[PDB]
Amino acid sequence: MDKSELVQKAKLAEQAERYDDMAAAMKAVTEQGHELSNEERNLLSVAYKNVVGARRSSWRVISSIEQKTERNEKKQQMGKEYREKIEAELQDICNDVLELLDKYLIPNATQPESKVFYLKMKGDYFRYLSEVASGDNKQTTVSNSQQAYQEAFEISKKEMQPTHPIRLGLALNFSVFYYEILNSPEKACSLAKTAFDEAIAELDTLNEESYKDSTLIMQLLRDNLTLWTS
C-alpha cells in the first residue's frame, strides 16, 4: 500500500490514541525501504515511544507491587510471570525498532540531522532493554546504548548547532542514560551543563520558533541538572 495511505492511517491512529496501529503502520512505511520525511520520521518516533512507554509503566508498576509484602506464594508467582510477560513484550517492541534502525533507517539516513536522530533512538531502545535485562545480556545492552548515543553525539558536535533540538534532545537522554542506567550523577550533570551552556552562548542569534522547541528541551536539561545536584 502507498506510504500516503499508511501515513494517513497512522495519523488517524494517532488522534484515535491507538498507537499499536500507528506504529504498525509507520513500520510498514519504513520497510518500503525509502528515507522518511521529517514528518514520517516523527510519526514513527512518536508511535513507538507510546507503544513502549505503556509496557514500561506497566512493567514498573508490577515491579513496585512485586516489591510489596506479599504472602500468597501464588500471588507472588503470578506477579513474576506477569512482570516477565510484560518484559518479553517490552523486549519485542525494542528489537523491532532496533531492527528497523539497523536494517532500514540508519543506513538509508542521508542528512546529518537524520543520522544523529536515529542513533539517539538506537541508544534509547537499548536503554529500554537494559532496564529489563538480566545476567550477561544486561552488560551487552547497556554498552550498545552508549555506543549509539556516543556515535550520535560526535556527529551532532560536528554537524549541528548547540541549540539544534535534535542535539539538545540527544544531550538530554544521554545525560539521563548516565544517571539512571550507569548510576553516575557526575557524568549526567557534566553532559547536561555543557549541552546547556553551549546553547545559551548562541541562543540570542536564533529567535522565535527555532527557539521554542530548543528552550523546552533546555528546560528539561535544567530540571534534571538541579534535581540531580540536590
Partner: peptide, 5 residues
C-alpha cells in the same frame, strides 16, 4: 527525570 520524543 524528563526527556523528549
Amino acid at each position: 527525570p524528563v526527556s523528549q520524543a
